[PDB]
């Protein structure tokens, strides 16, 4: 019985590079201890199909990769969400059917406002739905 | 049953009191009666690993906290001006039986919808233990 | 063992009607998501999770609906009316409690349903089975 889930949030207080690795570091799940709190990425052990999820605060422009794959990863698809002197939150989300040693992560881009914090949180969770 | 589901709604035109539990009064599906439209809250019946999401829409000022057993979990704000936007948030957790989950507002409380614009509150079990 | 779980995003829509089409899919386990007609049909019954994020610039009114026995079932709403010009995603999601041949789609409101056409961000639509009946 395979029980594969995890939420994290980024509480740390650093703005974020184009094509950086955005990492969440405080972990509220992680049965099977997939996800990596020190990277940010998740990286799959049972093939399968999972769903990742992510809710992003923000006070300006936003766009953020959705990254798979195992020694190079590609962006399966980009979200972004624009706010002008506002505050925003966002959200994105994807099922995935996904093969042993590879990763899935969100990767900052040239819109990098992002907010991690007590009454603004940044949250980025996943799943296995069936297993190979 | 052996497994727990719900997606709840809010019909009312009336938004939330300031700093109090948001109350989703009507069911779309609850069919083991986990979320509790009397109380505003889920109880957990059958223990495991819940998913919990949240859309909420507003024409001013939100933040939407959840709330498992009177520790706030995750809190998500949004800020418009008249017009409306969706507010969302969601976490995995974990839960032991009899604990409780919900939704909160704090100052900013605003759940107006403009007409075709909703609000939803769901949860799952997925993996029992 | 069912695995029934979707999703699709927008790229070479074909245009016109209510219906949002969600050309281009990422994953389609037991295919019950139609690309050309943007309907998942349902299969095996029981409780499934459907969800959206879509882009938008300017008005933007979305619904998942759903089909028994060809008879449209309308359902909650979720808009996003900034309206003015600059990405907004509005999203959405339920549980529904499907029987075999049930269809379920994304519809806009006719009055306001400008999805964003481009290669610089996305639109998703997805679902899952969470359990069979």
Redesign the interface.
Same mark, same amino acid.
């Given at each position: 019985t395979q029980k594969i889930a995890f939420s994290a949030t980024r509480t740390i207080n650093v703005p974020l590079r184009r094509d950086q690795t955005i990492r969440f570091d405080h972990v509220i799940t992680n049965m099977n201890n997939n996800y990596e709190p020190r990277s940010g990425k998740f990286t799959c052990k049972v093939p399968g199909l999972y769903y990742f999820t992510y809710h992003a605060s923000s006070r300006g422009n936003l766009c953020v990769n959705l990254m798979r794959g195992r020694e190079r990863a590609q962006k399966v698809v980009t979200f972004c969400d624009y706010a002008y002197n506002t505050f925003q939150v966002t959200t994105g989300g994807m099922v995935l059917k996904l093969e042993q040693g590879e990763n899935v992560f969100l990767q900052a881009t040239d819109k990098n406002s992002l907010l991690g914090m007590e009454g603004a949180n940044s949250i980025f969770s996943g799943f296995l739905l069936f297993p190979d | 049953k052996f497994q727990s589901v719900f997606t709840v709604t809010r019909q009312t035109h009336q938004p939330p009191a300031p700093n109090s539990l948001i109350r989703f009064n009507a069911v779309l599906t609850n069919p083991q009666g986990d979320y509790d439209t009397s109380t505003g809250k889920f109880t957990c019946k059958v223990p495991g690993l819940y998913y919990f999401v949240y859309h909420a829409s507003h024409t001013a000022n939100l933040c939407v906290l959840l709330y498992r057993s009177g520790v706030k979990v995750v809190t998500f704000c949004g800020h418009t001006s008249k017009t409306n936007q969706v507010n969302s948030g969601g976490v995995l957790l974990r839960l032991q039986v009899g604990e409780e989950v919900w939704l909160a507002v704090n100052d900013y409380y605003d759940m107006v919808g403009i007409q075709g614009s909703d609000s939803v509150f769901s949860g799952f079990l997925l993996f029992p233990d | #063992?069912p695995?029934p779980?979707?999703?699709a995003?927008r790229r070479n829509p074909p245009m016109g009607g209510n219906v949002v089409i969600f050309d281009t899919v990422?994953?389609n #386990?037991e295919e019950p998501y139609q690309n050309h007609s943007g309907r998942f049909v349902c299969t095996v019954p029981g409780?499934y999770?459907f $969800?959206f994020?879509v882009?938008s610039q300017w008005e933007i +009114?979305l619904?998942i609906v759903s089909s028994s026995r060809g008879q449209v079932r309308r359902?909650?709403?979720? +808009? !996003? $009316?900034?309206?003015?010009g600059?990405?907004?995603?509005?999203?959405?999601?339920?549980?529904?409690?499907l029987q075999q041949g049930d269809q379920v789609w994304v519809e806009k !409101?006719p009055k306001?349903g400008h999805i964003y056409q481009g290669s610089?961000? !996305?639109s998703?639509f997805?679902?899952?089975?969470?359990?069979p009946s």
């Amino acid at each position: 019985t395979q029980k594969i889930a995890f939420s994290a949030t980024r509480t740390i207080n650093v703005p974020l590079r184009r094509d950086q690795t955005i990492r969440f570091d405080h972990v509220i799940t992680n049965m099977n201890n997939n996800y990596e709190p020190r990277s940010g990425k998740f990286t799959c052990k049972v093939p399968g199909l999972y769903y990742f999820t992510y809710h992003a605060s923000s006070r300006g422009n936003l766009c953020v990769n959705l990254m798979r794959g195992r020694e190079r990863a590609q962006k399966v698809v980009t979200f972004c969400d624009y706010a002008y002197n506002t505050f925003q939150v966002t959200t994105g989300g994807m099922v995935l059917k996904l093969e042993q040693g590879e990763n899935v992560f969100l990767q900052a881009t040239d819109k990098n406002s992002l907010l991690g914090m007590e009454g603004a949180n940044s949250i980025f969770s996943g799943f296995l739905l069936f297993p190979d | 049953k052996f497994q727990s589901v719900f997606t709840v709604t809010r019909q009312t035109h009336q938004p939330p009191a300031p700093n109090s539990l948001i109350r989703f009064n009507a069911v779309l599906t609850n069919p083991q009666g986990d979320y509790d439209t009397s109380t505003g809250k889920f109880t957990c019946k059958v223990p495991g690993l819940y998913y919990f999401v949240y859309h909420a829409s507003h024409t001013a000022n939100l933040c939407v906290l959840l709330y498992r057993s009177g520790v706030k979990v995750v809190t998500f704000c949004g800020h418009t001006s008249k017009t409306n936007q969706v507010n969302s948030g969601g976490v995995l957790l974990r839960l032991q039986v009899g604990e409780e989950v919900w939704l909160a507002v704090n100052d900013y409380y605003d759940m107006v919808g403009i007409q075709g614009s909703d609000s939803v509150f769901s949860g799952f079990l997925l993996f029992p233990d | #063992q069912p695995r029934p779980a979707f999703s699709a995003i927008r790229r070479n829509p074909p245009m016109g009607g209510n219906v949002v089409i969600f050309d281009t899919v990422i994953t389609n #386990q037991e295919e019950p998501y139609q690309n050309h007609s943007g309907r998942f049909v349902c299969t095996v019954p029981g409780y499934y999770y459907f $969800t959206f994020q879509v882009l938008s610039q300017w008005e933007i +009114c979305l619904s998942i609906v759903s089909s028994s026995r060809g008879q449209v079932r309308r359902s909650l709403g979720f +808009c !996003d $009316t900034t309206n003015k010009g600059l990405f907004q995603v509005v999203s959405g999601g339920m549980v529904l409690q499907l029987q075999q041949g049930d269809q379920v789609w994304v519809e806009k !409101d006719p009055k306001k349903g400008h999805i964003y056409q481009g290669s610089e961000a !996305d639109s998703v639509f997805s679902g899952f089975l969470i359990f069979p009946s």
